[PDB]
Amino acid sequence: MNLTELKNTPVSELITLGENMGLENLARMRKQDIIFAILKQHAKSGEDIFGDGVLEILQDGFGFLRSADSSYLAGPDDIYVSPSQIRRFNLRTGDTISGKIRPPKEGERYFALLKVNEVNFDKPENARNKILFENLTPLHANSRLRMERGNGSTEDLTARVLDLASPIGRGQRGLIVAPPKAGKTMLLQNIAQSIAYNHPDCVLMVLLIDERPEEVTEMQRLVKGEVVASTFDEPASRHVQVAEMVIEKAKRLVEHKKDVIILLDSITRLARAYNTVVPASGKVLTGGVDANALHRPKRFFGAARNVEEGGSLTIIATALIDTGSKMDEVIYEEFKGTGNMELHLSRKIAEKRVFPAIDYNRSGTRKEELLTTQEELQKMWILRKIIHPMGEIDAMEFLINKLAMTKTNDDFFEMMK
Amino acid sequence: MNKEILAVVEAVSNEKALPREKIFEALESALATATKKKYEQEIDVRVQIDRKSGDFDTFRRWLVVDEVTQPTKEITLEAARYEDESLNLGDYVEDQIESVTFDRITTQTAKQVIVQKVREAERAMVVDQFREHEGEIITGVVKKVNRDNISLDLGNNAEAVILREDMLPRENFRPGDRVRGVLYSVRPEARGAQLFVTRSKPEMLIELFRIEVPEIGEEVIEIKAAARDPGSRAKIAVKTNDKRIDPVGACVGMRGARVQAVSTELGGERIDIVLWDDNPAQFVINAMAPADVASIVVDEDKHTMDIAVEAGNLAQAIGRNGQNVRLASQ
């Protein structure tokens, strides 16, 4: 019995399964506890078990297998592994491990993985032979990640204008400078749907930090990808833990030569959490923000790169500006000159009912010629030349009108002639 | 001394829940309690710390009445000749000044009043900000369960209460799960439990509809009446302002899907949705569904509905604990 095929089942299904397994009324224990009791009985009936989970090595050296639905938390449904397996198969944080597991014993509180049959969708023999993510040589983005869907609906424009504003490729470093009341969640949903339709080969990773639960349940069953989030109902410890472990998973996937893309929202709240989780450094700058407190977020932002050997790690992080917060002000000030891909959204256009509120002149992409041929190069150059003298709102509405007049970017380029 | 009170008023973490004005009036109440504890008499007084100008002072309240007990707060209804009262009742004085507000007992009573009022202020703010949600479905995680009452964390220091009658006789929870419910009772002046949230009703089910049915919310299918035996049965009679919209065809759904979805969301509760009629006779004929009756005796003088069922449908017209009747009776 696999853990995913049992947990992604609805809660009522788990209740009926436990009741059919001859158990006490399962409406009392939590989902993790229900899974634990169900596995306990299903193993009491024999049934050599097959489990899976993302690995986390603690300070002692053992490993815990966390699950994706619980946003990588600690529960009775966790699988314990001794450091002997980590020394043998040469495991590390972020490596998803799947294999045979057994029932627990008295005094033990978690299951034990006996033998691994899959490490990051690979043979356990080749799991020890893999170049480190840090030893890789980063490069610029070369393969263009086209976001144009092709149906020309009222939502496809959201990606069309995107492709008309700043090209995006594998391993690109992305920032979303947008004030509140702007619809960043809509932009993230649109980009997730675009990457799920156009490029289903690369694994999609969407992360929501310090977010309201409604968006969490919306994203967990709207986009085609593994959605891990963390609401504000938990201290900054869980936030920084899930951040570190999702970036470790992404690093392991890239080491396995896989193109991963991490959508993060928001980098500002994540930096806030990283600031309040770290002890003081001795002194204080404006906004109550510590000096080294941004070292970990900055690293998280710099982990994105285009590997020359194989694989890529693209990141798109949304930032919170114009909130009247000294802390957010200094966070955006630090993060401004950090990435090579930026998208600025105008609040004045956002709350003017002109979607998507984009800023053309303020947004751009460094080394964009490596992500597009000369054709779209000259097309975007002409577009920028004609849009630079124009204003903000008038230019935005004119561009969105001329975009909705057609289906794709090619028809717009042709009508622009 | 004023430096200490300025430090304690600026060092407030939740300055929103307690701004300078109410913090200073809390300190006024604390100093009044301290002065009460100073003298063996029981005299109520005010402080008026002069928030932004300088240090504090004290007054003396009289509460003019014809009594004589505790003469520190006793002034007759006409003692307004000298000392410039000029009013019948409510005349107070600044007689007492020089109040010590730094000793051990003063500090203790100050801390006591401060913690009491920060509790009161967080209660007031949470109820004022989440009271308008009365009538809507909100989620939340429980944190403590007892044999008489359970607590719920909503977030941002928001605490909801669920009593015994607020829970079903067989529903179950434990700290960690996310349960949803509607807030029905609100007491912004309560000392403890504030957000009385539960479902325990069919109107809650109505709200569920408003969340799950996009048509419901614009009054496309009017819900007339509904009754619920908790975890046992849910009788409901609705009408339709339109003639092409079938309530038993639309609200129930396809092959009994929407009603079964609501049942499995509530934990397997038999729900009988029926069409409302403009006559109590046919209304109670249809309300006992599934059944078949051909006897109607309605009396508006005695409020009596004699609806005799055919022999054989008894176990279907009465049910367990008289459900098909006891709900229909209500």
Place this chain on the structure above:
DNA sequence: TATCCGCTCACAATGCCACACGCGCTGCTCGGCCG
């Protein structure tokens, strides 16, 4: 070569409580150096 004698260095001269107090080759130059 004895053997008494002297020198002188090493080993002693109860044993209980209560209270009080305290820091006398380390400061300035040459030699070291694996988380």
Place this chain on the structure above:
RNA sequence: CACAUUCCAACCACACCUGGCGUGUGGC
């Protein structure tokens, strides 16, 4: 395949401080 450290419902464990040495004083 195998040893296997299994990490923070009442409550058990998370408990405490100067004769080192000299001197001085007093009593038996």
